[PDB]
Amino acid sequence: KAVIAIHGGAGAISRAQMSLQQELRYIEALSAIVETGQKMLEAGESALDVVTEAVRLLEECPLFNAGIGAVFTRDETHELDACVMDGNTLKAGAVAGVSHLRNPVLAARLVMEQSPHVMMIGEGAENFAFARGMERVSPEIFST
Amino acid sequence: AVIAIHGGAGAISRAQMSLQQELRYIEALSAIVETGQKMLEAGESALDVVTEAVRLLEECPLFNAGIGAVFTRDETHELDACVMDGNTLKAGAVAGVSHLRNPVLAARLVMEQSPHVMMIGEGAENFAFARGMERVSPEIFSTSLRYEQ
Amino acid sequence: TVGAVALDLDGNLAAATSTGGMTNKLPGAVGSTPLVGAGCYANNASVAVSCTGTGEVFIRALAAYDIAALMDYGGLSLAEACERVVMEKLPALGGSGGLIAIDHEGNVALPFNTEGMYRAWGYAGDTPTTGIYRE
Amino acid sequence: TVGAVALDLDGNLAAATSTGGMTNKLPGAVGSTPLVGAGCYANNASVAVSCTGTGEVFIRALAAYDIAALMDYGGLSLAEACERVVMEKLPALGGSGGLIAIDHEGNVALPFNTEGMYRAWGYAGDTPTTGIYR
Ligand SMILES: [Cl-]
Ligand SMILES: [Cl-]
Ligand SMILES: [Cl-]
Ligand code: NA
Ligand code: NA
């Protein structure tokens, strides 16, 4: 029995703070992403490809603190981090402190699959990703 | 009370080394473990003992940490360190630092003076400089042995 | 912080986690997200886990791997392992948040000790469930 | 890579690890050294561990925490836990290296699967032991 779960963060979310219309934007986004993942699993896509695409869609969604809609540092910059792990091979990839990669989970998959390392950080991670044809973006794209 | 230390695992070959070359490593290991044993005997904390032992292994150019660090593909040094207290389960770590003489001291600083376990790169360095740790040139780490490797 | 865990039709587990991190964080600060066993872990023998919450605590407690070790070595169920980590061990170290986890038998858990966790799950060929608040 | 583990007179465990990484590494690569549970771990309930060797494998296997978990949850002795991780699980993932570990009872292990590991240990008020080769 194939199955997916997702999250968009845990914290002090208060009913008194939010309208039903505000809640439904989060419920709609969560439902669309988990449905995409359910459809990929049903069609026989790998767990690895499913968690990658789900987290890529949570990055793209401005409601969640990852990729577009990332919080700001003390210096009003964005520094993004991501990790992916394959339970079959126990391979993993991760990036931390990246600012010029649109989808950190894609950079993490690239570290997993195209490097001898589990983790790369900062400009080194970025330069490695660019050398393998991932696009350079401005960290301005994450700001909402 | 007891200390153990290491200076790295790998393909160390006896056919390649003289006894005099080996004894440099044995002397350095013996002096550091003895310092730690004397600290433990004087009632120093396990945390302070592992910090000092690793600081002395960083200082010792025979070992791949601090002075005597290996080179990156770009002929630079990028150092990493972690320290953990089994009593409080607090930890501190730095990675990808080039301008801090004793990464294990920067890791202790992250543990004690930051809300984080880990800091990386220039951000880790700026954190440490802002708290009075000195900036060094990564030239101080370079040896002929590691370059030839 | 966002995350996903999945079990595929071949019996493979995977996990992924992504974040912009702690709001107003010191530049260069690193939380649990990119650290295997802290914010992300998967092993076909046990469980896939993605974590969200106080980064320094999820690292110190190795929250994601701890679920796996409690199941694999401890013989705890996913539900027992999730309770132990999220409701007992994490708060004991001052940590708040939650995680999603799927075990090799397709059990799903979405524990959290906070007011909310944006979450959803579904079996393939079934209807999704979504949540924000407790219960 | 260098490291130290100690048990003090108060019964407290601690660990620390430091490295320059691997010769010729890709700039920005991060191995096990700075990752809690991978290259460094200490917990008064179990063990203090410092690790050296193939960084990506020590991370994937969470070698340092796995010693602790194998003892705490698995009921393995420090010696059994060290054998399992260093001689079985790390090579199974293509990993080479070793670790130093002290448990809360003052047992010491210095396992390694490589040709050598620069190592030393000693009880307080006793004479140190040193090693390079098997
Ligand atoms: Cl309405
Ligand atoms: Cl459920
Ligand atoms: Cl709800
Ligand atoms: Na987003
Ligand atoms: Na050194």
Numbering used by the authors:
A (entry chain CCC): 3 to 146
B (entry chain AAA): 4 to 152
C (entry chain DDD): 179 to 313
D (entry chain BBB): 179 to 312
Sentences reproduced from the published study:
l-Asparaginases hydrolyze l-asparagine to l-aspartic acid and ammonia. The prototypic class 2 enzyme is EcAIII from E. coli. EcAIII belongs to the Ntn-hydrolases, which are expressed as immature polypeptides that dimerize and then autocatalytically cleave themselves into α (∼20 kDa) and β (∼15 kDa) subunits to form the mature (αβ)2 heterotetramer (a dimer of two αβ heterodimers). The same Thr179 acts as the nucleophile in the autoproteolytic maturation and in l-asparagine hydrolysis.
